[PDB]
């Protein structure tokens, strides 16, 4: 019934293309298209890991109590902004052992909703109500890179990189839940297969993107640097 | 025309959506939606283990004894408020042999409904006062992180982290028991498959946030103080 333009750029046109690609369109159906899209995006971001949904940010360690941000889903490289240094993640028992038994390497763990560090780190960041003030990040400022949970659509004008990069993915993953809402199985299976194929293509692209500029050959690393 | 909202975040809207995806509008069926949601939430939390439903609480060790909370499902890392000293679980036959044949590691067991620590550690609870004052944690404390079981809704406006994270999960798992009540097999199969896929996605997400960001080689060397 409804019309739509060639590019599905925004939520407003996606919620109409959904009803178009499925003639099952009416009052009792269009009102829940938002819920189907919500379920589809949740099913997507639950396991999708790609750059465009990443986010880098400084942390405040406070030697221990340092807390995990709300948007934490998976941690990428973690380091500082001074001469470079990469942390490695270990288990709580290793850190508890390091505490008593005893600074080039630095470890960390995940205690519930915290990030513990064996050394008494003193990373500094501006407080909450600070107005602007980039602060010219001081030293001992760790920078964390992780995968952040993207926002949920709340306005027809609201757009997202997924719409501009792969709208068919959302359209199929939401037609799945649509054909589930109504009684239909063939469409469910076909849309699920197509969405899974698109997601596989995207993750394979991400894979072929990483470490894709030259071959590798470990040069028999046996710690040439031992003197220190 | 039962109309639900887009951000499904409460118990009433979830109930209305369950009654919507099962178009039948009859008292014989609507009056049991609460029972179906109860069965679903009891099916999910019975084996779901994730951070958000965890909880931290201070124990009240008197003399190498304790009592498990009434909301205990599974225990993970335990330690003290200072220096760490993660505890490690053992069995009765060992924590009772240590006493006979026994810088100081810690061990604990489960004697039905009582944690039994060998060294006879002592713990204390923090300041209780509710006069808008901090808890003022106590010295010689022991922290425990367990997967607490959530409370039943028993109210419309009530909610939970699941309704915001994965409402489709509870929706499908309760429509499963609904389509079991009425003899509908294909629907049962579809809803169960969808719920299983959702739970698989969730547990996989909980695994890709674990100790992943590092090589698995160079096995650690936590040997001893004797080099």
């Amino acid at each position: 019934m409804p019309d739509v333009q060639y590019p599905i750029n925004t939520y407003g046109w996606l919620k109409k293309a959904v009803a178009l690609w499925a003639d099952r369109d009416d009052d009792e159906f269009v009102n829940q298209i938002p819920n189907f899209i919500n379920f589809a995006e949740k099913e997507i971001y639950r396991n999708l890991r790609i750059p465009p949904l990443e986010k880098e940010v400084y942390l405040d360690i406070k030697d221990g109590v340092a807390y995990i941000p709300p948007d934490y889903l998976e941690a990428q490289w973690m380091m500082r902004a001074k001469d470079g240094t990469i942390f490695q993640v270990t288990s709580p028992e290793e850190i508890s052992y390091r505490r008593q038994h005893g600074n080039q390497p630095v470890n960390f763990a995940r205690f519930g909703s915290r990030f513990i560090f064996y050394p008494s780190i003193e990373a500094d960041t501006p407080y909450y109500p600070d107005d602007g003030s980039p602060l010219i990040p001081a030293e001992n400022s760790v920078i964390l890179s992780y995968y952040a949970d993207p926002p949920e659509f709340h306005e027809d004008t609201d757009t997202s990189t997924i719409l501009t990069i792969a709208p068919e993915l959302l359209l199929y993953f939401t037609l799945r839940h649509a054909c589930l809402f109504v009684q239909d199985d063939n469409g469910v299976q076909k849309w699920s297969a197509l969405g899974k194929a698109i997601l596989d293509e995207m993750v394979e692209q991400n894979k072929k993107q990483e470490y894709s500029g030259s071959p590798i050959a470990i040069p028999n690393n046996m710690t040439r640097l031992q003197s220190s | 025309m039962p109309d639900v909202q887009y951000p499904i975040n409460t118990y009433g809207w979830l109930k209305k959506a369950v009654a919507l995806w099962a178009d039948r509008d009859d008292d014989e069926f609507v009056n049991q939606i609460p029972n179906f949601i109860n069965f679903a939430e009891k099916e999910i939390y019975r084996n779901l283990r994730i951070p958000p439903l965890e909880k931290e609480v201070y124990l009240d060790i008197k003399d190498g004894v304790a009592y498990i909370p009434p909301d205990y499902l599974e225990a993970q890392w335990m330690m003290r408020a200072k220096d760490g000293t993660i505890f490690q679980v053992t069995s009765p036959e060992e924590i009772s042999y240590r006493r006979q044949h026994g810088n100081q590691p810690v061990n604990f067991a489960r004697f039905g409904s009582r944690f039994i620590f060998y060294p006879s550690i002592e713990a204390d609870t923090p300041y209780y006062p509710d006069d808008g004052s901090p808890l003022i944690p106590a010295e010689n404390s022991v922290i425990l992180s367990y997967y607490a079981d959530p409370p039943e809704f028993h109210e419309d406006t009530d909610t939970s982290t699941i309704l915001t994270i994965a409402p489709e999960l509870l929706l499908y798992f309760t429509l499963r028991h609904a389509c079991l009540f009425v003899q509908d097999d294909n629907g049962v199969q579809k809803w169960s498959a969808l719920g299983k896929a959702i739970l698989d996605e969730m547990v996989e997400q909980n695994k890709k946030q674990e100790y992943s960001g590092s090589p698995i080689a160079i096995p650690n060397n936590m040997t001893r103080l004797q080099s």
Binding site: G64 | Y58, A81, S133, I143
Partner: peptide, 27 residues
């Protein structure tokens, strides 16, 4: 020197504890 993770409501109530003293010191 490490504490437990209270619920958000408890942290909120703890934050408001830092108002009455200020109100008196301003009075």
């Amino acid at each position: 020197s490490i504490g437990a993770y209270k619920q958000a409501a408890e942290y909120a109530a703890d934050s408001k504890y830092w108002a009455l003293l200020a109100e008196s010191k301003f009075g």
